[PDB]
Curated annotation (Swiss-Prot), chain A:
Transmembrane segments: none annotated. The keyword ATP-binding applies. This is T-complex protein 1 subunit delta. Its main location: cytoplasm. PANTHER family: CHAPERONIN. It comes from the Eukaryota. InterPro entries: Chap_CCT_delta (IPR012717), Chaperone_TCP-1 (IPR017998), Chaperonin_TCP-1_CS (IPR002194), Cpn60/GroEL/TCP-1 (IPR002423), GroEL-like_apical_dom_sf (IPR027409), GROEL-like_equatorial_sf (IPR027413), TCP-1-like_intermed_sf (IPR027410), TCP-1_chaperonin (IPR053374). Present with 5530 molecules/cell in log phase SD medium.
From Swiss-Prot, chain B:
GO terms for cellular component: chaperonin-containing T-complex; cytoplasm. The keyword Acetylation applies. Belongs to the TCP-1 chaperonin family. PROSITE patterns: TCP1_1 (PS00750), TCP1_2 (PS00751), TCP1_3 (PS00995). Pfam families: Cpn60_TCP1. It comes from the Eukaryota. InterPro entries: Chap_CCT_beta, Chaperone_TCP-1, Chaperonin_TCP-1_CS, Cpn60/GroEL/TCP-1, GroEL-like_apical_dom_sf, GROEL-like_equatorial_sf, TCP-1-like_intermed_sf. This is T-complex protein 1 subunit beta. Transmembrane segments: none annotated. CDD domains: TCP1_beta.
Curated annotation (Swiss-Prot), chain D:
GO terms for biological process: chaperone mediated protein folding independent of cofactor; protein folding. This is T-complex protein 1 subunit epsilon. Molecular chaperone; assists the folding of proteins upon ATP hydrolysis. Known to play a role, in vitro, in the folding of actin and tubulin. In yeast may play a role in mitotic spindle formation. It comes from Saccharomyces cerevisiae (strain ATCC 204508 / S288c) (Baker's yeast). One of its GO terms (cellular component) is chaperonin-containing T-complex.
Curated annotation (Swiss-Prot), chain E:
PANTHER family: CHAPERONIN. Pfam families: Cpn60_TCP1. It comes from Saccharomyces cerevisiae (strain ATCC 204508 / S288c) (Baker's yeast). This is T-complex protein 1 subunit beta. Belongs to the TCP-1 chaperonin family. GO terms for biological process: chaperone mediated protein folding independent of cofactor; protein folding. Molecular chaperone; assists the folding of proteins upon ATP hydrolysis. Known to play a role, in vitro, in the folding of actin and tubulin. In yeast may play a role in mitotic spindle formation. The keyword Transmembrane does not apply.
Length: 479, 505, 63, 502, 444
C-alpha cells in the first residue's frame, strides 16, 4: 500500500516546490494558460492553485488549506504550502526506515501543539487598548501597495472598525460583515465610516424621486413593482406599504422584470417614499444581519415588526459616485457592522485598495483571537528549531527521531526567503543562528512585523494536511 | 530477495525431487542424459541429487551438507534432505511474513531442538536386556583386539578392566570419562582399576593431605611473579624498591578476587599457574585449598564428571556452576606423588593405571586401548531403538508445543513453526503410500496430544494403529543423526543473506 | 503540460530572439521593410516598425 | 560537476550496502565462489571485498584501503566502509543545499579531531586496574570472534596461544607486531584441540632416508643444535661414482669443522649424498623454499651463508633440538623445532576437521593478534559494541551549537553519520534501530555518562562494562581516521575517465 | 474460474475497508467521473454502497452489511473483514489441505459455538451499584465515538450519550432522541435537553410564550398541529380565538409527539442559530430527549449525524443486556483459545478447518495494530503468551504500545454486539463457500 502514498507525496512535493519559488515579493511568478486562452500572472498561491485545475485528488486539498489560511489568518498562503511540502519531503526518508505513517501523523499533531506555547513565551505581549502598535501594524503592511502617503489615514480607520466588533471574549469575528464598496470618482482622502450600513448602488435617477428621506424604515422586500387599470393595480401595492409606514424600499435585482414602474414613481413621490433598486443577491444576507430585518417574498408577508429604523437616508453628491448612506439603525438585537466606501479616479485604484484593506483587517483580527506579534523574516521558524534541539534528546522511541526531522523541515521557510532575495541560502541562515546566542527575536527597527496567528495557523493547518495525506492508502473509482 | 528465493524455492524444487522417494512405498524418478541412452532408474536420494547438475549456487551447498551424513553414518541420507527441505518451507513462511534477519529465528530452532532430543530419551527403549549375554560377548571381542598388541601378554586381566570401564559407566561413552595413568618401573599384570579421578604432582607444602566435603572452582590467574616481560617499558623511579612495590600494588587488587573465592562457600581453589606465598597464606585462614598444575585437559575431564563448568574470569560473586567431591586423598605410588578424588556428586568415571617397563610400552598401551574401547562402546549407541511409525515424530511435535508455552514474543512463531515441520514427515509418508494425509495426521495428533497414546502410522490397514503391537521400531541413533544434521543444514542456508551466482560450467 | 527549470527559460529567450531578429532589419531610416502575409494571402509594404508589431501574428506570452 | 556528485554517492552506497548486514557477530554470512569453482562462506568483510573484480572507479577505493587495514588493524574492514558510506550520505544532502565539497572534506577532519579529545577524558585504564585483568582481556579477545563458530567450544585452548606468542615477537619499546614474523600454516584433517604453539619455524621434512634418526643428539653436551643454511645447491663440480664421492668429502668437511648437526639446502640431493651423511649422523634436508630460510635465521639467531667457502660456526643457527612428532592420525608425521629462549619470530600451528574451519581459524587468529598489540601500545581503552559511536555522537552534536559558521552544519551531519553504526548494529541485531538509539542516548544523559552498547549476540543485560567487553582505543581511533581519509579521496575526485576494451 | 473470482473478489472488498477499522484507522477517498463529488469519510457502509462492483459474489456482502447497519449501525467493517479472512484461509483449506468444502462449513458451525461460549464465560455484569454500571456505559460510548471527528471532544461527549440513555427508562426505540444540528460554535458546546426542541415555529404573528397549552394532533385547545400547510384567513382567525396553529409537521414529527404527550405546562420560543425554536416544558412523564450538536461546517454535521445515531443504538441495547466484555483485541483473543480448546477432540477432515478459524480470529486485532503504527506480529504474540495459560486480563493497547489492562484504561464492549458480529459474519461466509459456479441470465 506504500506505492499509493509515495506516488501522492512525490506529486504533492512537486506542487509545493513549484509554489516555493513564489514566496516573498521578490519570488518567481508562475504562469498558467487556461484552455480558453486566458493567461494570468501573479505570485499569489491561492490564485495559482485555484486556476491550476489539478487532477491529482490529494493535491487538491492544498486549495482548501490555502482557503482556510486566508479566511482565518489572512496571510501565509504560500508559506503554508511550503511547510506542507517540507513535512512531505521529510516523510520520504521516514518510510524508508520502516516507520508506519500513524506514528508520523500522531507526532506532527503533538509537535504542533507544543510549538504554539514556545512562540507565545517568546512573543511580545500587547493589548487592544494601546492604539500605538495598532496603527503602525496596518501602516507598514500597506508599503507593498500603491497607497503610500494616504495609507497613514487609513490605518486608524481600520483600527477603530475592529475594536467595536472585537469586544473581548468574542474571539473570531466574521469578516463577511465588513463590506467595502468601491466606486469610481472621488479620492482616497475622503472616507466615511457610516456604522449604520452602506449599500452597493445608487438611487432612482428618474423624475419625481426624492432621493432623500428623514426618519424612515428600511426592510428587505423580494416583491417587484410591475404592471399586470394599471394605476389601480399599482395603487394597492403602494397603499399596503403606507400601512406600515415604510419609506425605504429595497428590491432584489432580477433580470426577469423591471423594479419600479414609472407610474408608481409619481405615487411614491407624494408619499415621500425613497426607493433603491438593483440590490445584489450577495447583499440580501448582509442587510438581513446588520439591519435586523427579514427578507419578505410577497406583499402579505410584509409587516411592520420586520422593518428597521433609519435616522436620515440621503444620497451624497459626489463626482461619478452618488453614494447613499444610512446612520442610526437603532436596533438592539442586531449588532452594528462596519461598511467603508472606497473612492478613486482610476478603476485600478479602488480595486487594489479593497484588497489592501483585506490584509489590514486580518492582521488586526489576528490580535483579537490571540494577542501578540512575532517579527517575521525567519525568526519564528528558527526559534522553534532551537528549542526542539535539546528537547529531542529528552524523548524516547521512534518519536525521538521525528523531532529532529520536524525541526529540519521548519528551516525550509527561512531558506527560501534568502534564496528569493538573491543572497546565499546557507550563509544567511548560519548568520541568524550564530547571533541566536545573544539576540533572540531580532527586523524590529525595520518596521516589519507579523501576527502570531499566521505562524500558528500555518503550523496547525500543515500538520493536519500532511496527517490526512498519509491516511489515503488506495485510490478507487466510485461513480 | 532472489537470494532467499534461490535458497528456498530453488532448494525446495530440488528438495521435492527426493521428497517423494522417502520410504519403501515412495515414488521413483528417471534420470535422463543428453544422449538419453545412458540413463538409469533408481530410488536412491543421494544418487539423484549428485547426478543432476544444478546451476543454482544455493543448491550446491545442500550437496556438501548431505555428504556429512554419509561419512559420519551413511544411513537415512534421504530423510535428512527431506527434513531439511521441510524446515525451509516453514522458514520461508516465517521470513516473508516478517522480513527480519533469520539469525533470531535460528536461535529458536536451537531451543526447540533441545526439547526434541529430551522427548526421544524418555520414550527410548533398548535391546540391552539380558546384559549377561552382552557382557560375555564384550570380553571376547576385547581379547580379539589385543592380538598383535603388546597387551596380548595377559588377555583376561586387561579385558576385565575394559569390561568394568564400560558397563559401569551408565552414561556417555566418551573417553574423557576414562583417565589413563602411565608410570614406569612396574608390570602390566599389576594394573588396577580405580573409580576416582587421579592426578600427579601433589599440590602445596603445608596444606593437609585429606580434604572432606571439597568444592571445585575453575579459574585462570597468575598470583606469583606478575609482569612476565618488563623489558622495553620506560621505568622512571627514584629507587629500585619502587619496582617491586608496583608488583605488590597490582597483586593487592587481586585480594578482592580472593575475597570472592571465600564468598563462594568453597574450601578448595584450582589454578593453572603458580601462587605466591602471601595469597597462599591467606588461603589457610580463609580455609581455601590451592591446587596447582591443573593444565587444561584434566580440567575439562574433571568438570564434566563433577557437574561443573570452566571459566577464566569472575563475572559476579555467588553466581557459578560448581562441582564437589567428598574425600580427597594424597597417596604416593611409583616414586611419584599422586592425588585421589572420591565422592563426586553423580560422579560416573573410572581410571586405569597401567605399569610399563619403558615409555614405548606406555604409549602403545594407551592408543591400543582407545581403539578397543571405541569398538565396544559403539554397540552402546547401536541396536538401541525407539517407538516408530510416526509416533516419535509426533512426540517431538508435542514436545515443541510445550516449549511454545513459555517463549518470547518474537520467538513464539519461530518455535511453533518448528513443530509444523515435524508434522510434515507423516504428511509426506501418507502421500507417498497413497493415503490421505489430512485425515490420518489430524487424527494422529489429537490422540497423541494428551496422554496414554501408543498409536502410530499403520500403512497396511490405512488407519491409525498401535505400533507396539505390530512391533514397528526405529533406531535411536538415526533419530538424533537426522535431527542434528537437519538443524545444522538449516543454519548454513539461513545464515547466508546474499548468494552470488556461481560460475556456469 | 507543465515545463519548469532552465528548459523553459531558454525557450523564452529563443522565442523573443526570433521575434527580435525579424524587426532588426527595419531599425533606422536606412533599414529594410518587410511583407506580412495573412491567411487570405494578401500583404502590405511599410517601413514603420510600429505598424509591423501590431499586424504581426505571434503566439507566445512574452511575444 | 553535474552528474558526478550524484553518481559517486549512489555507487559507493550500493557497494557498501552489501556488507551492512554482515557487521557484528550476528551479521549474516555470504556464499562466495572462486573462479576455480571453490565455494567459500565467511563473515569477514576483507574476504568479500578482496574477491570483488569491478571496473567502477569509486568502488576501487574500498579495495585499496582494505589492504592496509588488515596489517594495521584488521577489524576496520566492515566497520569503516559502513562508516565511510554514512559520511557520503550526509554529504549528498549538503551538496544539494549548495555546500562546497572541500568544506565537507575539511569539516569532517576538524570534527574527527574534536571527538578524539572527548573520548580521551572518558576512557579507562587496564593495567592501572590490575595486572591479571589485562590477561583476562587477552583470553576473552579471541572468544568474541570465535563465539559464532563451532570453535567456541574449545576457545579456551586458543586463548593461551595468542598471549605467549605476542610477548616474544613484540618488545615493549617499539610495541610493534610484524606480520612477516608470524608464520601462519595449517592443514586439513585432525581436530582443533591438537593445535600447539611453536617458538620457531616448522619446516616439515621426511628426514630423507628412513635410517636417519628422528631426533638430534646433544653430541656430548654441546651448546644448542647447530644448523647449516645453504643458498647454493649441492652438486659435484662440473663446468664416476668414486669421482663424485671424493668431491663430496671435501665439501662435507665444512660441516664437520663448523659442527653443524643438520644440513639444510634449497635444492634436492643425490642418492650417494645421503649415504655419507647417514654414517655421520647428519640428517639431510632438501626442497626448502626461499622464504622459509628467512624464518630459520631469525628464530635460531643465524645468518645467511651465500656459498660453501663462507660457512662458519658463528653463522650457524642454534636451537634446542629437532624431533619428529606425530600429529593426530595424519600420516604426514611433521616435525617440531623448539628453542626454549625468546625469539624474534613465531609460527602459528592451527588444525581443523574441515578445510573451511582451518581458513576461518587462521583469519580469526590474525585479528586476535592485532588486538593484543593495540592493548599494549595504548593502555587507555573504550567500550565498543555501539557505546563508542553514541558517545561520539552526543559529543560532536553538543559542540555543534558552540561552533558557529558553516562548520555548524558540518558537525551536525558528522554526528548523524556516526549514528549509522549503532543503528546498523541495531538492525543487524533484529531490533528497532531508532527505538534503540533513543534508549542509549537517554541512559548516558539523565542518569550518568557511561558506556552502554547494542547487543548483537544475546547476553544477560546491557552495560557491557559489567561483562568486561573491551575494545582498543587506538584501534577504534585508527578506524575513524581511515574513514575520514577515504571520504575525502572520494570527494576529492570529481572526474571519471575510462577507456574501452580492445 | 468462479471460485477463484469469488475468493479474490471478496478479499478486494475487505481490502477497501481494511483501513476504516479501529480508532487508529485511516480515511478512504473516492473519485467519480465528475471529480467534484470526492468526499473523505471512514464510514464502511458509505464505501460499500457507493463503489459499484461487477462481481455477483461481492454483492452478497453488500446486502448483508445493510442488515447489520439496521440493527446497530457500527461494527459493519469488522463483519466484512472477518468474512474476508475466512475466505482467504479457505483457499489454503481447499487446495493444499485436502478438505471437503462442506466440511469447511461444518467446521465453522462447531467453531462458532465455541466462540459464543467463550464470550458467555467472559461476560460479567454488575446489577448492584448502578454508578458502576453508568461508568460501563461511558466506556462503551467512547468506543462507539471512535474513528470519528468527535473523538476530540469525546471525553466531554462521554457523559452526553451516557446521561441521555439514563433519561429514557423504557423501550429501546430511538424515536425518543431527536438530533438537531446547528452551524456555529465548537463541538463541545452541545448540551442535553429533554424539552423537545422543535425546528419550526407556529403562526405568522403569535405570542412566543404559551402557558397551560393543550397539544392536539390533527375542543378548547391552546395549540393546534396540522400535517399540511395552513390557508391565510383561518391563520388570522385562529389568532383571535387564541388557538396557535403549527405547520410543517412530517411523519417523523408526529411519531415523536405520540411518545411524549394532550397538554403541556409551558411552551417557550427561543432563538438559536438564527432560526426560531420551540422548547416545550412541563410534559407528562416525558421519555424523550433532544441532543443539539453545534458543528463548524455542514460536512462536520453530516458525519456527526450517523456517528451519534450509531452510538446511541448500541447504548440502547445495553439496557436489555447488562453483560459486558473486554475489547481492544482482548475479545478476539479469548475466543481464539476456545477454538483450540475444542480442537483436542475432533475428526480428521474438520481439524484443519476449525484451526484455520482460530487464526482468523487473530487477523482482526492484527489490522488494528497495523493502523496504530505498531508491529502486529510483535505485540499480539506477547499478549497471546499471557492469554495462553490463565491470567487473562490485559489486552492490546493502541496508544502507549505496551501490554496494559483494558479495565484500567476504560476499554470494554457489549456482549450483545459481539454475539451479533460472530453470527452474521459466520452466516455471510457460509453462503460464499457454497457457490462454486455463477450463471447470469441474458439481460434485456
Amino acid at each position: 500500500p506504500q506505492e499509493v502514498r509515495k506516488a501522492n507525496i512525490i506529486a504533492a512535493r512537486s506542487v509545493a516546490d513549484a509554489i516555493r519559488t513564489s514566496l516573498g515579493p521578490k519570488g518567481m511568478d508562475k504562469m498558467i494558460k487556461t484552455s480558453r486562452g486566458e493567461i494570468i500572472i501573479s505570485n499569489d498561491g491561492h490564485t495559482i492553485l485555484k486556476q491550476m485545475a489539478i487532477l491529482h485528488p490529494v493535491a487538491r486539498m492544498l486549495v482548501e488549506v490555502s482557503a482556510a489560511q486566508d479566511s482565518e489568518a489572512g496571510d501565509g498562503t504560500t508559506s503554508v504550502v511550503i511547510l506542507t511540502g517540507a513535512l512531505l519531503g521529510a516523510a520520504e526518508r521516514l518510510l524508508n526506515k520502516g516507520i508506519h505513517p500513524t506514528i508520523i501523523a500522531d507526532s506532527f499533531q503533538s509537535a504542533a501543539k507544543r510549538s504554539v506555547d514556545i512562540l507565545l513565551e517568546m512573543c511580545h505581549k500587547v493589548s487592544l487598548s494601546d492604539r500605538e502598535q495598532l496603527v503602525r501594524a496596518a501602516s507598514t503592511s500597506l508599503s507593498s501597495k500603491i497607497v503610500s502617503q494616504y495609507s497613514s489615514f487609513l490605518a486608524p480607520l481600520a483600527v477603530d472598525s475592529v475594536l467595536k466588533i472585537s469586544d473581548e471574549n468574542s474571539k473570531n469575528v466574521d469578516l463577511n460583515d465588513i463590506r467595502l464598496v468601491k466606486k469610481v470618482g472621488g479620492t482616497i482622502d475622503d472616507t466615511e465610516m457610516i456604522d449604520g450600513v452602506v449599500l452597493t448602488q445608487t438611487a432612482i435617477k428618474s423624475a419625481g424621486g426624492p432621493t432623500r428621506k428623514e426618519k424612515a424604515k428600511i426592510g428587505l422586500i423580494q416583491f417587484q413593482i410591475s404592471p399586470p387599470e394599471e394605476r389601480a393595480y399599482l395603487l394597492n401595492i403602494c397603499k399596503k406599504i403606507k400601512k406600515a409606514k415604510c419609506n425605504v424600499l429595497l428590491i432584489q435585482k432580477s433580470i426577469l422584470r423591471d423594479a419600479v414602474n414609472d407610474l408608481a414613481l409619481h405615487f411614491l413621490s407624494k408619499l415621500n417614499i425613497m426607493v433603491v433598486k438593483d440590490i445584489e443577491r450577495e447583499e440580501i444576507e448582509f442587510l438581513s444581519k446588520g439591519l435586523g430585518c427579514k427578507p419578505i417574498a410577497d406583499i402579505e408577508l410584509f409587516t411592520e415588526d420586520r422593518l428597521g429604523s433609519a435616522d436620515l437616508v440621503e444620497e451624497i453628491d459626489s463626482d461619478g459616485s452618488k453614494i447613499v448612506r444610512v446612520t442610526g439603525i437603532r436596533n438592539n438585537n442586531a449588532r452594528p457592522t462596519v461598511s467603508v466606501v472606497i473612492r478613486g479616479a482610476n478603476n485600478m485604484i479602488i480595486d487594489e485598495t479593497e484588497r489592501s484593506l483585506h490584509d489590514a483587517l486580518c492582521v488586526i483580527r489576528c490580535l483579537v483571537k490571540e494577542r501578540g506579534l512575532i517579527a517575521g523574516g525567519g525568526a519564528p521558524e528558527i526559534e522553534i528549531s532551537r528549542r526542539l534541539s535539546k528537547e529531542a534528546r529528552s524523548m524516547e522511541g521512534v518519536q525521538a527521531f521525528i523531532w529532529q526531522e520536524f525541526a529540519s523541515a521548519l528551516e525550509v521557510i527561512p531558506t527560501t526567503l534568502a534564496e528569493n532575495a538573491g543572497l546565499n541560502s546557507i550563509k544567511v541562515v548560519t548568520e541568524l543562528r550564530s547571533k541566536h546566542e545573544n539576540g533572540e527575536l531580532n527586523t524590529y527597527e525595520e518596521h516589519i512585523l507579523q501576527p502570531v496567528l499566521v505562524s500558528t495557523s500555518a503550523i496547525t493547518l500543515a500538520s493536519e494536511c500532511v496527517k490526512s495525506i498519509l491516511r489515503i492508502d488506495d485510490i478507487a473509482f466510485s461513480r | 530477495e532472489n537470494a532467499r528465493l534461490s535458497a528456498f524455492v530453488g532448494a525446495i524444487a530440488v528438495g521435492d525431487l527426493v521428497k517423494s522417494t522417502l520410504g519403501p512405498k515412495g515414488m521413483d524418478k528417471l534420470l535422463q542424459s543428453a544422449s538419453s541412452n545412458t540413463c538409469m532408474v533408481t530410488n536412491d536420494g543421494a544418487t539423484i541429487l549428485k547426478s543432476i547438475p544444478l546451476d543454482n549456487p544455493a543448491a550446491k551447498v545442500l550437496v556438501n551438507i548431505s555428504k556429512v551424513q554419509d561419512d559420519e553414518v551413511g544411513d537415512g541420507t534421504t530423510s535428512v534432505t527431506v527434513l531439511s527441505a521441510e524446515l525451509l518451507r516453514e522458514a520461508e513462511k516465517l521470513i516473508d511474513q516478517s522480513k527480519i534477519h533469520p539469525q533470531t529465528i535460528i536461535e529458536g530452532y536451537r531451543l526447540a531442538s533441545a526439547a526434541a532430543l529430551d522427548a526421544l530419551t524418555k520414550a527410548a527403549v533398548d535391546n540391552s536386556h539380558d546384559k549377561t549375554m552382552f557382557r560375555e560377548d564384550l570380553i571376547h571381542i576385547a581379547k580379539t583386539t589385543l592380538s598383535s598388541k603388546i597387551l596380548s601378554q595377559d588377555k583376561d586381566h586387561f579385558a576385565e578392566l575394559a569390561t568394568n570401564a564400560i558397563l559401569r559407566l551408565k552414561g556417555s561413552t566418551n573417553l574423557e570419562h576414562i583417565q589413563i595413568i602411565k608410570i614406569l618401573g612396574g608390570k602390566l599384570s599389576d594394573s588396577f582399576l580405580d573409580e576416582g579421578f587421579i592426578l600427579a604432582k601433589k599440590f602445596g607444602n603445608n596444606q593437609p593431605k585429606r580434604i572432606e566435603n571439597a568444592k571445585i572452582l575453575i579459574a585462570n590467574t597468575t598470583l606469583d611473579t606478575d609482569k612476565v616481560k618488563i623489558f622495553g617499558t620506560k621505568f622512571k623511579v627514584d629507587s629500585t624498591a619502587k619496582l617491586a612495590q608496583l608488583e605488590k600494588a597490582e597483586r593487592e587488587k587481586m585480594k578482592n578476587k580472593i575475597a570472592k573465592i571465600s564468598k563462594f562457600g568453597i574450601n578448595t581453589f584450582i589454578n593453572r599457574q603458580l601462587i605466591y606465598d602471601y595469597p597462599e597464606q591467606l588461603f589457610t585462614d580463609l580455609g581455601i585449598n590451592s591446587i596447582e598444575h591443573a593444565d587444561f585437559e584434566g580440567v575439562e575431564r574433571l568438570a564434566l564428571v563433577t557437574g561443573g563448568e570452566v571459566v577464566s574470569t569472575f563475572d559476579e560473586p555467588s553466581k557459578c556452576k560448581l562441582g564437589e567431591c567428598d574425600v580427597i586423598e594424597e597417596i604416593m605410588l611409583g616414586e611419584q606423588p599422586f592425588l585421589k578424588f572420591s565422592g563426586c556428586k553423580a560422579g560416573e568415571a573410572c581410571t586405569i593405571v597401567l605399569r610399563g617397563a619403558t615409555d614405548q610400552t606406555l604409549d602403545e598401551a594407551e592408543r591400543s586401548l582407545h581403539d578397543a574401547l571405541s569398538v565396544l562402546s559403539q554397540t552402546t549407541k547401536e541396536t538401541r531403538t525407539v517407538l516408530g511409525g510416526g509416533c516419535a515424530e509426533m512426540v517431538m511435535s508435542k514436545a515443541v508445543d510445550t516449549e511454545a508455552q513459555n517463549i518470547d514474543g518474537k520467538k513464539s512463531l519461530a518455535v511453533e513453526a518448528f513443530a509444523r515441520a515435524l508434522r510434515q514427515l507423516p504428511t509426506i509418508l501418507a502421500d507417498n503410500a497413497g493415503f490421505d494425509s489430512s485425515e490420518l495426521v489430524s487424527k494422529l495428533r489429537s490422540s497423541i496430544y494428551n496422554g496414554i497414546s501408543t498409536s502410530g502410522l499403520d500403512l497396511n490397514n490405512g488407519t491409525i494403529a498401535d505400533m507396539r503391537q505390530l512391533g514397528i521400531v526405529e533406531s535411536y541413533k538415526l533419530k538424533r543423526a537426522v535431527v542434528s544434521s537437519a538443524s545444522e543444514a538449516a543454519e548454513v542456508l539461513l545464515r547466508v543473506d546474499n548468494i552470488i551466482r556461481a560460475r556456469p560450467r | 503540460e507543465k515545463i519548469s527549470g532552465d528548459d523553459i527559460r531558454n525557450q523564452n529567450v529563443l522565442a523573443t530572439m526570433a521575434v527580435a531578429n525579424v524587426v532588426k532589419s527595419s531599425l533606422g531610416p536606412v533599414g529594410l521593410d518587410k511583407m506580412l502575409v495573412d491567411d487570405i494571402g494578401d500583404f502590405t509594404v511599410t517601413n514603420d516598425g510600429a505598424t509591423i508589431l501590431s499586424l504581426l501574428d505571434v503566439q507566445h506570452p512574452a511575444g | 560537476g553535474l552528474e558526478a556528485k550524484k553518481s559517486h554517492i549512489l555507487a559507493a552506497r550500493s557497494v557498501a550496502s552489501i556488507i551492512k548486514t554482515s557487521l557484528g557477530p550476528r551479521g549474516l554470512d555470504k556464499i562466495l565462489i572462486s573462479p576455480d569453482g571453490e565455494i567459500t562462506i565467511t563473515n569477514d568483510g576483507a574476504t568479500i571485498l578482496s574477491q570483488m573484480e569491478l571496473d567502477n572507479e569509486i568502488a576501487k577505493l574500498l579495495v585499496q584501503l582494505s589492504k592496509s587495514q588488515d596489517d594495521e588493524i584488521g577489524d576496520g574492514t566492515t566497520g569503516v566502509v559502513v562508516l565511510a558510506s554514512a559520511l557520503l550520505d550526509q554529504a549528498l544532502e549538503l551538496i544539494q543545499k549548495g555546500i562546497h565539497p572541500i568544506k565537507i572534506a575539511n569539516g569532517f577532519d576538524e570534527a574527527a579531531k574534536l571527538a578524539i579529545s572527548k573520548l580521551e577524558e572518558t576512557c579507562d585504564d587496564i593495567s592501572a586496574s590490575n595486572d591479571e585483568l589485562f590477561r583476562d582481556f587477552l583470553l576473552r579477545a579471541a572468544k568474541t570472534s570465535l563465539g559464532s563458530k563451532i570453535v567456541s567450544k574449545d576457545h579456551d585452548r586458543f586463548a593461551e596461544m595468542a598471549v605467549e606468542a605476542v610477548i616474544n615477537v613484540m618488545d615493549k619499546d617499539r610495541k610493534d607486531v610484524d606480520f612477516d614474523l608470524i608464520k601462519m600454516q595449517g592443514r586439513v584433517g585432525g581436530s582443533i584441540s591438537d593445535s600447539k604453539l611453536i617458538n620457531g619455524v616448522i619446516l616439515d621434512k621426511d628426514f630423507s632416508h628412513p635410517q636417519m634418526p628422528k631426533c638430534v643428539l646433544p653430541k656430548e653436551g654441546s651448546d644448542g643444535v647447530k644448523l647449516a643454511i645453504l643458498t647454493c645447491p649441492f652438486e659435484p663440480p662440473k663446468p664416476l661414482q668414486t669421482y663424485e664421492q671424493d668431491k663430496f668429502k671435501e665439501m662435507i668437511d665444512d660441516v664437520k669443522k663448523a659442527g653443524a648437526d643438520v644440513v639444510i639446502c634449497q635444492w634436492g640431493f643425490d642418492d650417494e649424498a645421503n649415504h655419507l651423511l647417514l654414517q655421520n649422523d647428519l640428517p639431510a634436508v632438501r626442497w626448502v623454499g626461499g622464504q622459509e630460510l628467512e624464518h630459520i635465521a631469525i628464530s635460531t639467531n643465524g645468518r645467511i651463508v651465500p656459498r660453501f667457502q663462507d660457512l662458519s660456526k658463528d653463522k650457524l643457527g642454534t636451537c634446542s633440538r629437532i624431533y619428529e612428532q606425530e600429529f593426530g592420525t595424519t600420516k604426514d608425521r611433521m616435525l617440531i623445532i623448539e628453542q626454549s629462549k625468546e625469539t624474534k619470530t613465531v609460527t602459528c600451528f592451527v588444525r581443523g576437521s574441515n578445510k573451511m574451519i582451518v581458513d576461518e581459524a587462521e583469519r580469526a587468529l590474525h585479528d586476535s593478534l592485532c588486538v593484543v598489540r593495540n592493548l599494549v601500545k595504548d593502555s587507555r581503552v573504550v567500550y565498543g559494541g555501539g557505546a563508542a559511536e553514541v558517545t561520539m555522537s552526543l559529543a560532536v552534536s553538543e559542540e555543534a551549537d558552540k561552533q558557529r559558521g558553516i562548520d555548524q552544519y558540518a558537525f551536525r551531519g558528522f554526528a548523524q553519520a556516526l549514528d549509522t553504526i549503532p543503528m546498523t548494529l541495531a538492525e543487524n541485531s533484529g531490533l528497532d534501530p531508532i527505538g534503540t538509539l533513543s534508549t542509549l542516548k537517554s541512559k548516558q544523559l539523565k542518569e550518568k555518562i557511561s558506556n552502554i552498547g547494542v547487543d548483537c549476540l544475546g547476553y544477560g543485560s546491557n552495560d557491557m562494562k559489567e561483562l568486561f567487553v573491551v575494545d582498543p582505543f587506538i584501534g577504534k581511533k585508527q578506524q575513524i581516521l581511515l574513514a575520514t581519509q577515504l571520504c575525502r579521496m572520494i570527494l576529492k575526485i570529481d572526474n571519471v575517465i575510462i577507456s574501452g576494451k580492445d
